[PDB]
Design an enzyme around this catalytic site. Structure first.
Site, PDB file in Angstrom:
ATOM      1  N   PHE A 138       0.989  -1.093   0.065  1.00 60.23           N
ATOM      2  CA  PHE A 138       0.049   0.249   0.180  1.00 60.23           C
ATOM      3  C   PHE A 138       1.073   1.262   0.352  1.00 60.23           C
ATOM      4  O   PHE A 138       0.879   1.834  -1.115  1.00 60.23           O
ATOM      5  CB  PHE A 138      -1.202   0.353   1.673  1.00 60.23           C
ATOM      6  CG  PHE A 138      -1.480   0.930   1.418  1.00 60.23           C
ATOM      7  CD1 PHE A 138      -3.073   1.152   0.977  1.00 60.23           C
ATOM      8  CD2 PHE A 138      -1.517   1.964   2.586  1.00 60.23           C
ATOM      9  CE1 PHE A 138      -3.415   2.819   0.405  1.00 60.23           C
ATOM     10  CE2 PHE A 138      -2.198   3.633   2.629  1.00 60.23           C
ATOM     11  CZ  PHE A 138      -3.385   3.149   1.567  1.00 60.23           C
ATOM     12  N   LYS A 198       0.693  -7.902  -9.474  1.00 61.83           N
ATOM     13  CA  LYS A 198       0.213  -7.906  -8.818  1.00 61.83           C
ATOM     14  C   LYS A 198      -0.200  -6.908  -6.785  1.00 61.83           C
ATOM     15  O   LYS A 198       0.598  -7.468  -6.359  1.00 61.83           O
ATOM     16  CB  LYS A 198      -0.390  -8.955  -7.830  1.00 61.83           C
ATOM     17  CG  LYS A 198      -1.312  -9.975  -6.885  1.00 61.83           C
ATOM     18  CD  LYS A 198      -2.221  -8.545  -6.561  1.00 61.83           C
ATOM     19  CE  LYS A 198      -2.719  -8.931  -4.938  1.00 61.83           C
ATOM     20  NZ  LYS A 198      -3.160  -7.545  -4.732  1.00 61.83           N
ATOM     21  N   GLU A 212      -4.515  -3.620  -3.700  1.00 61.40           N
ATOM     22  CA  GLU A 212      -5.740  -3.353  -4.716  1.00 61.40           C
ATOM     23  C   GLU A 212      -6.364  -1.926  -3.482  1.00 61.40           C
ATOM     24  O   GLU A 212      -7.048  -1.075  -3.966  1.00 61.40           O
ATOM     25  CB  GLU A 212      -7.076  -4.081  -3.410  1.00 61.40           C
ATOM     26  CG  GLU A 212      -6.643  -5.625  -3.255  1.00 61.40           C
ATOM     27  CD  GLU A 212      -6.192  -6.165  -2.375  1.00 61.40           C
ATOM     28  OE1 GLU A 212      -4.525  -5.505  -1.842  1.00 61.40           O
ATOM     29  OE2 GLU A 212      -6.020  -7.095  -0.769  1.00 61.40           O
ATOM     30  N   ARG A 213      -5.605  -1.287  -2.565  1.00 57.52           N
ATOM     31  CA  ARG A 213      -6.016  -0.238  -1.892  1.00 57.52           C
ATOM     32  C   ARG A 213      -5.644   1.681  -2.245  1.00 57.52           C
ATOM     33  O   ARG A 213      -6.235   2.291  -2.274  1.00 57.52           O
ATOM     34  CB  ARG A 213      -5.421  -0.269  -0.868  1.00 57.52           C
ATOM     35  CG  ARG A 213      -6.301  -1.404   0.691  1.00 57.52           C
ATOM     36  CD  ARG A 213      -6.037  -0.648   1.838  1.00 57.52           C
ATOM     37  NE  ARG A 213      -4.959  -0.465   2.704  1.00 57.52           N
ATOM     38  CZ  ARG A 213      -4.169  -1.735   2.943  1.00 57.52           C
ATOM     39  NH1 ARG A 213      -4.864  -2.796   2.866  1.00 57.52           N
ATOM     40  NH2 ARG A 213      -3.558  -1.351   3.868  1.00 57.52           N
ATOM     41  N   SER A 231       3.864  -7.336   4.593  1.00 54.29           N
ATOM     42  CA  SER A 231       4.415  -7.257   6.642  1.00 54.29           C
ATOM     43  C   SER A 231       4.729  -9.067   6.289  1.00 54.29           C
ATOM     44  O   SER A 231       4.647  -9.634   5.923  1.00 54.29           O
ATOM     45  CB  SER A 231       2.308  -7.320   6.610  1.00 54.29           C
ATOM     46  OG  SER A 231       1.548  -8.878   6.418  1.00 54.29           O
ATOM     47  N   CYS A 253      13.116  10.644   6.706  1.00 59.41           N
ATOM     48  CA  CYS A 253      13.206  10.652   7.859  1.00 59.41           C
ATOM     49  C   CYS A 253      12.764   9.342   8.513  1.00 59.41           C
ATOM     50  O   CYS A 253      13.434   8.693   7.221  1.00 59.41           O
ATOM     51  CB  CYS A 253      12.164  10.728   9.201  1.00 59.41           C
ATOM     52  SG  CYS A 253       9.989  11.403   9.039  1.00 59.41           S
TER      53      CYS A 253
HETATM   54  N1  LIG Z   1      -3.149 -12.980   3.492  1.00 56.87           N
HETATM   55  C1  LIG Z   1      -2.829 -12.992   1.936  1.00 56.87           C
HETATM   56  N2  LIG Z   1      -2.244 -13.830   1.227  1.00 56.87           N
HETATM   57  C2  LIG Z   1      -1.053 -13.720   0.119  1.00 56.87           C
HETATM   58  N3  LIG Z   1      -1.708 -12.023   0.164  1.00 56.87           N
HETATM   59  C3  LIG Z   1      -1.686 -11.233   0.546  1.00 56.87           C
HETATM   60  C4  LIG Z   1      -2.708 -11.481   1.937  1.00 56.87           C
HETATM   61  N4  LIG Z   1      -3.348 -10.363   2.274  1.00 56.87           N
HETATM   62  C5  LIG Z   1      -2.729  -9.604   1.109  1.00 56.87           C
HETATM   63  N5  LIG Z   1      -1.824 -10.301   0.061  1.00 56.87           N
HETATM   64  C6  LIG Z   1      -1.275  -8.672  -0.547  1.00 56.87           C
HETATM   65  O1  LIG Z   1      -0.156  -8.432   0.239  1.00 56.87           O
HETATM   66  C7  LIG Z   1      -0.181  -6.991  -0.365  1.00 56.87           C
HETATM   67  C8  LIG Z   1       0.622  -6.416   0.849  1.00 56.87           C
HETATM   68  O2  LIG Z   1       0.765  -7.446   2.065  1.00 56.87           O
HETATM   69  P1  LIG Z   1      -0.213  -6.509   3.355  1.00 56.87           P
HETATM   70  O3  LIG Z   1       0.944  -6.773   4.739  1.00 56.87           O
HETATM   71  O4  LIG Z   1      -1.802  -6.724   3.670  1.00 56.87           O
HETATM   72  O5  LIG Z   1       0.453  -4.884   3.614  1.00 56.87           O
HETATM   73  P2  LIG Z   1      -0.314  -3.757   3.489  1.00 56.87           P
HETATM   74  O6  LIG Z   1       0.250  -3.415   4.529  1.00 56.87           O
HETATM   75  O7  LIG Z   1      -0.676  -2.993   2.063  1.00 56.87           O
HETATM   76  O8  LIG Z   1      -2.338  -4.110   3.117  1.00 56.87           O
HETATM   77  C9  LIG Z   1      -1.143  -6.964  -0.971  1.00 56.87           C
HETATM   78  O9  LIG Z   1      -1.425  -6.278  -2.488  1.00 56.87           O
HETATM   79  C10 LIG Z   1      -1.775  -8.002  -0.955  1.00 56.87           C
HETATM   80  O10 LIG Z   1      -2.408  -7.976  -2.014  1.00 56.87           O
END
Ligand SMILES: Nc1ncnc2c1ncn2[C@@H]1O[C@H](COP(=O)(O)OP(=O)(O)O)[C@@H](O)[C@H]1O
Ligand SMILES: Nc1ncnc2c1ncn2[C@@H]1O[C@H](COP(=O)(O)OP(=O)(O)O)[C@@H](O)[C@H]1O
Lengths: 460, 454, 48, 44, 49
Positions: free
Chosen positions: B148, B172, B175-176, B225, B274
């Site tokens: 994001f 890929k 989504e946000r 994450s 920062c």
């Molecule tokens: N449970 C999941 N398993 C696999 N991929 C994921 C999952 N949830 C989110 N993603 C994908 O991983 C990416 C970022 O991970 P995420 O930890 O959700 O970071 P953010 O802090 O942007 O939400 C996004 O592009 C999302 O589509």
């Protein structure tokens, strides 16, 4: 008669506890005993290495280079003595054993020049009163677990480079031929190496599990069989360690229909039946014609308890529908009409065994080779330029031979992202070793100012 | 409410099926809809990329460099348009959003020169009628899953380099905020990129699982994450793929007793409220008590957060300033959940420790980040810290330009915020395979027409 | 040190980084040793 | 002995200017070690 | 372009735990006394460098 001692903390330790025997085929009369070490005896080594590290890390590059250069000399001095100790416990032509050590020495020669490619940059005042620099540092205490074939060269491929980079090393060699390895360790101490920088600890699964568990050891390096390699890789990596792992595999040759048969047969006969060679265990033939023809030429030339392993292997092969063309019961064995679902394809076997796999296209042959735990060498035999180009492009094996065999005498698959080649040009694949045993750092520094520097502002 | 399209096979596709909404964070109001793609819609992209690969792989280095150079120009042309699109769906200072894109462009500029460092050697007759050469080849079809924060730069840190090396790419994104990313993809096609070489497929866990499962995709690259990173790392590597994974982490500052407190507090206040710093490891109680004394006055300017704070109190941490932001915890230990679980927002934890060795061991023994500081006047302390800490970038009495904390998994390690020229080769090695070819064409005695085929 | 016919070597002994940096910056002697002596067995001032 | 040319090629006689306005400094540095780094070994 | 030719060398562990470096430093406050002919060039030949 004799018993072999550990080399912990710069002195030779005698362990009495569990113990196995070193034999010497062709006699199989047991010649010495080896101590299978406990976690306590390993923790000794770990503590020794952890202690030696800070001093060694700060030893000047040129002094480290110096001790390595004498190590190279003391090996070229004691060659006869070493090679004897290899042939005695491993059982191999003294000419092969000497050629192995010549390789080990090439590894030591490469390590002597690693300090040069490791110096980094400095910049005064990159910002106002802020200096910046970049360094390549050693990682700490590292360990290497070595196999039965090559008790000389495989350790000399690991620890000299790791020590040149400024780490300290625990070496757990093979129980089955550990005397030659230990001698070369001692010669390193004789060349000038501080106590604790290299330690040799004999043992087996216990000893290895000890190193995999120890949180002080930062990297783990292994060459041997594929099940043990997978083990050490996964269990090591899961505990935050860096793991470099070569596990036994099968090298494949591809024969196109237009292949010059005498040329292919020469390579296959040298590789499968003829350590001074290539390792090939599978010949993938495109089309039935070239396969039938290959068999026709191979068969004549193949006339130039512990046993139960090979009989079992061959018997399973027949059972699952392979054509046993030459039964070597050990002599040269040839299997035709082999498929990847058979056990004789999946399981690796000691001895002169070649399997022919018939396939319909080059794409199928490449997919066959790529889809398994692919090795470190492969060949294609053909007259077609387009085929050869495509093979070189799409095959995933790192070294490729077109109508020519490669100097890769044992087949290994490499696990993970810390990848090292055992048989490549040292100058070409050496940097991968250097990167495995070092960590990059980028430092930015400022000493925040005082307005005045009277004695009252400092400590007693 | 308009709809954002996929970019498969060189053309924009409209998917209607599962579908979520992109909001405008500073307006709280949903602006557009995004298509959560099925395995079929992904297999489209995979097939497109698999098809484009052989042509692209054989495209001359200089032609690949050429298309990248125009891509750089077309980004520097449309900056205003792009940045607007970032600030709109992510919600950030236009000045920050422009600084992000400037970084993305530095990544594109580095990729343009990757063909040069990828040339290999040739030797005629290394042996009798035996030629030898060495080459750096692309690996095939590769995929990148982006977060994001940074919808511009993180993709531009992955695909331009991978494409310059001769691979094809499936991206890929998040989504946000997926509109800004897609625009930059299109500009690449406008610069001259063949169809299928870059594809953008919007989606979620389904889409990602698709890429993790697809046996055609050879490498997988992720930043986000830590739980999702561990997922993709282990499940990817178990299927023979190369996986590069940066997962969210915590950067630590160390305070020695002799630290210039106003200097440390300045860094911590800039970083936490920062650089990214979320833990202050204090050696000795004096410096910790003193740090708290100075922090408290200056800390005066989701349902997730209350839960986080509440757990902290429950497990015995001292909640010194409750931001319900601007939250400060003291007497934190590594066994607490507030140390193990990372939290969005202005939260700093103080961990008291008795020696420098303990502080370094604390930092090294966990999922260590990409930046760390030590505050001290002692030269010997600083030297030791720089030697034994395992974090790649270190700041001595100075913060580092590392705005988000990440841990890097496995052996395929890349730095996101390092000097591109220094850590670029790691990227190049992740997207290439080395090959060593030895070749001989065995001879015939005569070359009459009878020796060839019809 | 600076106000006299300064020599060819000087040392500072300290644990403080800021002190050492300052000494190295503002001292006018050409070779400087921080917690380490220098291989300068006789002291000389250079004229002209 | 502090000689500069006024009319020579700048790239040729510039170093003489640079040497007139600079002094060379040669630093050797060591931070002598402690056995332990507990808080008791630092200040107030 | 004078800052470029003025960079110096760094060496970690030239001896055991002993770093060494060399720098080219400025000397301090300096003065220039200029003549009647050339009120432009002679100062620009001194102070910018
Ligand atoms: N449970 C999941 N398993 C696999 N991929 C994921 C999952 N949830 C989110 N993603 C994908 O991983 C990416 C970022 O991970 P995420 O930890 O959700 O970071 P953010 O802090 O942007 O939400 C996004 O592009 C999302 O589509
Ligand atoms: N179950 C096990 N787990 C871990 N290590 C093992 C196990 N069994 C043997 N080893 C160790 O693995 C090393 C090499 O494995 P192996 O594949 O037996 O090599 P080799 O090719 O020499 O037979 C040996 O040094 C041995 O001590």
């Amino acid at each position: 008669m004799t018993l072999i001692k550990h080399l912990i903390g710069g002195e030779l330790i005698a362990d009495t506890g569990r113990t196995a025997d070193v034999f010497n085929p062709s006699t199989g009369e047991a010649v010495r005993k080896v101590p299978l070490a406990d976690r306590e005896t390993m923790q000794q080594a770990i503590d020794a290495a952890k202690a030696a590290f800070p001093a060694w890390r700060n030893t000047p590059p040129a002094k480290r280079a110096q001790v390595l250069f004498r190590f190279k000399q003391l090996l070229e001095a004691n060659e006869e003595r070493i090679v004897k100790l290899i042939s005695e416990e491993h059982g191999k032509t003294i000419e092969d054993a000497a050629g192995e050590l010549k390789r080990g020495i090439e590894n030591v020669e490469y390590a002597t020049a690693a300090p040069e490619i490791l110096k980094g940059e400095y910049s005064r005042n990159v910002g106002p009163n802020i200096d910046a620099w970049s360094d390549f540092q050693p990682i700490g205490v590292v360990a290497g677990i070595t196999p039965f074939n090559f008790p000389a060269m495989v350790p000399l491929w690991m620890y000299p480079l790791a020590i040149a980079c400024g780490n300290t090393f625990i070496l757990k060699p093979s129980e089955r031929d550990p005397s030659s390895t230990l001698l070369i360790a001692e010669l390193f101490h004789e060349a000038g190496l501080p106590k604790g920088v290299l330690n040799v600890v004999h043992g087996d699964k216990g000893a290895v599990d000890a190193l995999i568990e120890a949180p002080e050891v930062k990297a783990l390096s292994f060459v041997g069989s594929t099940p043990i390699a997978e083990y050490i890789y996964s269990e090591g990596t899961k505990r935050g360690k860096r793991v470099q792992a070569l596990g036994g595999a099968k090298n494949h040759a591809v024969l196109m229909p237009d292949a010059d048969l005498d040329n292919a047969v020469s390579a296959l006969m040298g590789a499968a039946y003829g350590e001074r060679c290539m390792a090939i265990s599978v010949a993938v033939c495109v089309g039935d014609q070239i396969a039938d023809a290959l068999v026709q030429k191979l068969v004549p030339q193949i006339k130039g308890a512990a046993r139960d392993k090979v009989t079992g292997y061959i018997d399973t092969g027949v059972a699952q529908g392979a054509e046993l063309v030459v039964d070597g019961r050990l002599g040269g064995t040839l299997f035709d009409r082999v498929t990847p679902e058979m056990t004789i394809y999946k399981e690796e076997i000691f001895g002169p065994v070649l399997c022919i796999v018939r396939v319909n296209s080059l794409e199928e042959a490449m997919q066959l080779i790529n889809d398994h735990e692919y090795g470190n060498g492969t060949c294609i035999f053909t007259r077609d330029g387009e085929a050869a180009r495509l093979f070189c492009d799409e095959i995933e094996v790192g070294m490729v031979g077109v109508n020519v065999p490669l100097p890769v005498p044992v087949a290994y698959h490499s696990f993970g992202g810390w990848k090292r080649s055992l048989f490549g040009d040292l100058h070409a694949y050496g940097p991968d070793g250097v990167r495995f045993y070092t960590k990059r750092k980028a430092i930015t520094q400022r000493w925040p100012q005082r307005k005045s520097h009277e004695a009252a502002q400092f400590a007693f």
